[PDB]
């Protein structure tokens, strides 16, 4: 049943695309039914939005979140149904963490979808138009980005928001503070740093109150014991029991995603194989930079899926 060297990871914001899973859904009627079930909790038709648009709504986080959770759980159910090996550990990036919890049996898909729709709304409302920004900084040292953020802040907020791989940090916060940080890094030679299209400043102190709203939303739902442990982003550790798992999710929102740490924690626990379970191949790319010995494969397309099943079915 469970294969001890195998982990599944679940992508988050940035990984959606118009038509995601189109080609797998043509082969597997379960995919759309999974989207319909997610759609009931989310209150939007996630399949119609993600296949037909409008892309502008798809890219808006209260919609991207439940669509990506539906997508990740659709690929999970397909893999499970087709008797692929069961992973020993799960993790997911930001939103992906909720997908991992749905896969572990902690939340029903319906609740998960309702929950991340709400999470998206709470995060969007925490920073209205032009208030926030996020920027990917490529090739610098953690220490320097962290000291540069402290220098640029002033009275505003700018902080590391994703630790994604060595030489990839996302910073975010107040738009003017993010801009000052980039100017400071540019002055220091870094210069490979781009503003991201989604402006919501996730994983900074501007999400602090939105996290209290999230915690209260969580506390009305049933949480079940996980069937596979989930390595969580706030601290790259598995948490025991409902209260601790919800607490790590409240803290996730306003503190940085420790992606490098989550992946290193998996490797430390005997994981040598990783399936990216949902659309795109973002996490696979990051994994390749964190630890080049890990065998990372995406599952979001018919050829990738079939390639992974052939190599890892039990």
UniProtKB/TrEMBL annotation:
Active site: 94, 203
Sequence ranges assigned to domain Malonyl-CoA:ACP transacylase (MAT) in this UniProt record: 9-312
InterPro entries: Ac_transferase_dom_sf, Acyl_transferase_dom, Acyl_Trfase/lysoPLipase, Mal-CoA-ACP_Trans/PKS_FabD, Malonyl_CoA-ACP_transAc, Malonyl_CoA-ACP_transAc_FabD, Malonyl_transacylase_ACP-bd
EC number: 2.3.1.39
Enzyme kind, highest EC tier: transferase
The entry's keywords: Acyltransferase, Transferase
Family, similarity comment: Belongs to the fabD family.
Protein name according to UniProt: Malonyl CoA-acyl carrier protein transacylase
